[PDB]
């Protein structure tokens, strides 16, 4: 839904790396493995935590808010 705060296996904080991962993908033209390595995810548990994350929160956000202030 939204990127997890920590890696499930080891507990490395990965929730701060999602925007930089997307930026390395879309404006530095790196492939995903080099992007993960540049973020510093060397364990494949941490690599799949970002690589396999499906970020459904903007799909949820395209709907109008039910309570609007």
């Amino acid at each position: 839904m939204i990127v997890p705060v920590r890696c499930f296996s080891c507990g490395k904080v990965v929730g701060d790396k999602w925007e930089s991962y997307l930026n390395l993908l879309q404006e530095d033209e790196l492939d995903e493995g080099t992007a993960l390595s540049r973020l510093g995810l060397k364990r494949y548990c941490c690599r799949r935590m970002i690589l396999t994350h499906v970020d459904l929160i903007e799909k949820f956000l395209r709907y109008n808010p039910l309570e609007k202030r």
Binding site: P4, V5, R6, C7, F8, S9, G11
Partner: protein
């Protein structure tokens, strides 16, 4: 983990492995059986209900 059991990581469970939301919806109606026989939504009181 014998006979198809599995050992899951409690630390991974704490960090959110396979955590899920469960939603259950309860639907209720107020219906009019007759003239004065009508259901109504209100907070009931033990003195008169």
């Amino acid at each position: 983990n014998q006979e198809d059991s599995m050992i899951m990581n409690q630390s991974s469970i704490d960090r959110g492995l396979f955590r899920s939301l469960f939603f259950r919806s309860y639907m209720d109606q107020e219906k009019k059986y007759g003239m004065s026989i009508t259901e109504t939504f209100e907070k009931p009181q033990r003195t008169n209900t």
